[PDB]
Design a binder for this molecule. Structure first.
Ligand SMILES: CC(=O)N[C@@H]1[C@@H](O)[C@@H](F)[C@]2(C(=O)O)O[C@H]1[C@@H]([C@H](O)CO)O2
Length: 658
């Protein structure tokens, strides 16, 4: 179908444009689609892009609007006082503002479907809400509509929600166009998606992106595939990976690096209302916070992540128990059997389940997938699915049997309810991943695991040394391997905050000299330095010139291969804001060879200071461009939970940054 109205190049400069004569007499039937290409790089706090209203005295609550906020939220109002209807649908973090310093043309498609009684909004090719109602209100059927307006809503003769921006194209259709038709509308996106809702992971949500450039030129990414909304563990979360062989232009369909099967992989629309948004999958095992490195000697890619047993997350993990029993300088995974009140078993060499109360081996073994065998025979448990059909979250058996795993709620043998770290490897640069193995405990029997710093590990350029940063109360705990991740030792570095989420990322400034940048509780990013390949560490310093919130955000960091302004360069990615996870920046620092101090010379704003920017990953692509995969929303805010397709990827050149 062709549009009933089509207009373009409207400048919204805090003065509404009347298009009533052009549009109102063309509106007919109860279904409509609005397609709008617009820019707003300096928006007002709250502004309407498009309005249909009754402008008459006494009818201020009879209007339809498409509005946005300077937070990047998009929404509609559909109001008719005579019908007693006041619909307000919206989603935070749905917009782009600027890319490479130029205003972005957002493509908005709003579908008002009378037959299905559903209102659906897409922005930049992403569905941001779809709302079905019992009593449908057609948008041009509001009582006494007499104004069609761009850049405001006329209420009682006055301009409300005045806009700054521009509408480069606007079309309306007297039809609810199909999802397939929507997908054919040309986009002008500054970004691309690597992981997205409906892909092979079947997770509706993603968090904690990583990026790493492999020696072959393949660029690898990992991520938390989060099923139960965007909540951290306890939940169901798998670790997924995807790679690009063409400098980030296209990406492979994701596969899993680490996955559990005690709960079904379900694509679920997690509730965002205040009553239910804290619904949390409570009986599933999960992985969370992954990190990647490449090993030169073996050629293997190595991925670590935290592992959480069923119903466990950082909040309820036993802080006083590693989950391992120490014997002669050997650590063995403890197990508790159905009906016992103690952990009376251990897993020894070749996966043999051993009874500690009698010092006898049992007829149970644990295979390499941490699954339980009896007499070489695989035990199973019944899988769970989740649903909100009852009006609240229900987790219930679904009839499918899956291998019994010691991390599962329903297992005959269960691990200590605490957090662990696991590693897996790939021999084919991320086309497949091995079965994961648990790392041993590093801080003794009676201390829970450290928390892996998501992002990249560090492969020292001049040796086979691999380092993964982790954190715990009062220190960074660097995990060091010189034998392709076969064995690990820790190097502890005290930090002057307790209770910090001290997510740390490292760069090699030069041979054997490592600077680590990390999140703190002070509002400033901190750093420390090693000059002996991670054996020992300096005291902690802080970066001036970048602000974080009190709780802080992950920072990603790389050593750029090329000189900038004749100097060695480090690039940091972080929000720059004292208020929230917003104002994303790449900050370019030039190294002073005299003392290894860094001058933070260039700040590149990823998008508007008010638009969301949280965890991020950065990598130098083989062509010397910079790839950035980042959470484009405030992942701390309790108002921005459970958003789909907000982890996004962009390509930048150094000249863009400087
Ligand atoms: C292991 C783990 O929970 N890791 C978590 C991460 O996956 C994040 F989501 C985050 C966070 O957004 O700050 O950091 C922690 C968590 C919170 O601060 C508790 O540390 O929320």
């Amino acid at each position: 179908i062709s549009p009933i109205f089509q207009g373009g190049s409207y400048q919204l400069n805090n003065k509404s444009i009347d298009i009533s004569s052009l549009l109102l007499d063309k509106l007919s039937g109860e279904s409509q689609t609005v397609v709008m290409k617009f820019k707003a790089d300096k928006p007002n706090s709250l502004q309407a892009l498009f309005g249909l209203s009754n402008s008459k005295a006494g009818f201020k609550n009879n209007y339809f609007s498409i509005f946005m906020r300077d937070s990047g939220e998009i929404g509609v109002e559909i109001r008719d006082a005579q019908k007693g209807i006041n619909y307000l649908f919206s989603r935070p973090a749905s917009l782009w503002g600027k890319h490479k310093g130029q205003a972005v043309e957002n493509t908005l498609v709003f579908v008002s479907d009378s037959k299905d009684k559903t209102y659906t909004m897409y922005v930049n090719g992403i569905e941001v809400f779809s709302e079905t109602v019992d009593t449908f209100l057609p948008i041009s059927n509001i009582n006494g509509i007499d104004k069609a307006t761009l850049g405001a809503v006329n209420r009682e003769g006055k301009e409300h929600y005045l806009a700054k921006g521009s509408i480069d194209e606007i079309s309306l259709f007297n039809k609810a166009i199909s999802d397939q038709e929507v997908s054919t509308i040309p986009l002008s996106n500054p970004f691309q998606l690597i992981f997205q809702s409906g892909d092979s992971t079947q997770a509706n949500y993603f968090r904690i992106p990583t990026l790493y450039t492999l020696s072959s030129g393949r660029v690898l990414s990992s991520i938390d595939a989060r099923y139960g909304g965007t909540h951290d563990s306890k939940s169901k979360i798998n670790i997924a990976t995807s790679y690009s062989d063409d400098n980030g232009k296209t990406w492979s369909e994701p596969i899993f690096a680490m996955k559990f099967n005690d709960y079904e992989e379900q694509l679920v629309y997690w509730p965002r209302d205040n009553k239910l948004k804290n619904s949390q999958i409570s009986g599933s095992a999960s992985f969370i916070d992954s990190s990647i490195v490449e090993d030169k000697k073996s050629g293997k890619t190595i991925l670590l992540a935290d592992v959480m047993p069923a119903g466990i997350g950082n909040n309820n993990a036993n802080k006083a128990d590693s989950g391992f029993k120490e014997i002669n300088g050997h650590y063995y995974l403890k197990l508790k059997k159905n009906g016992d009140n103690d952990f009376r078993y251990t897993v020894r060499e070749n996966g043999v389940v051993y009874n500690e109360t009698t010092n006898k081996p049992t007829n149970y073994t644990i295979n390499d997938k941490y699954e339980v065998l009896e007499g070489g025979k695989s035990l199973t448990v019944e899988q769970y699915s989740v649903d909100f059909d009852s009006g609240s979250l229900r987790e219930r058996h679904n009839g499918k049997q899956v291998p019994m795993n010691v991390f599962y709620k329903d297992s005959l043998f269960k691990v200590t309810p605490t957090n662990y770290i696991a590693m897996t490897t790939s021999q084919n640069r991320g086309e497949s991943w091995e079965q994961f193995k648990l790392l041993p405990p590093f801080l003794g029997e009676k201390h829970n695991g450290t928390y892996l710093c998501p992002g990249q590990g560090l492969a020292l350029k001049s040796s086979n040394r691999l380092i993964f940063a982790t954190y715990t109360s009062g220190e960074l705990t660097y995990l060091i391997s010189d034998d392709s991740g076969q064995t690990w030792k820790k190097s502890s570095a005290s930090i002057p905050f307790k209770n910090a989420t001290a997510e740390a990322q490292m760069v090699e400034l030069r041979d054997g000299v490592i600077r680590t940048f990390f999140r703190t509780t002070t509002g400033k990013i901190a750093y420390m330095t090693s000059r002996d390949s991670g054996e020992t560490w300096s005291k902690v310093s802080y970066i001036d010139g970048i602000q974080q919130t009190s709780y802080g955000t992950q920072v990603s960091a790389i050593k750029y291969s090329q000189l900038i302004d004749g100097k060695e360069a480090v690039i940091l990615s972080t929000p720059n804001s004292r208020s929230g996870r917003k104002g994303g920046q790449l900050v370019v620092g030039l190294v002073n060879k005299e003392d290894d101090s860094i001058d933070w010379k260039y700040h590149y704003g990823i998008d508007l200071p008010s638009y969301g920017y949280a965890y991020s990953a950065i990598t130098e692509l083989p062509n010397h461009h910079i790839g950035v995969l980042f959470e484009k929303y405030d992942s701390w805010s309790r108002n921005e939970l459970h958003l789909s397709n907000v982890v996004q990827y962009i390509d930048l050149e150094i000249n863009d940054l400087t």
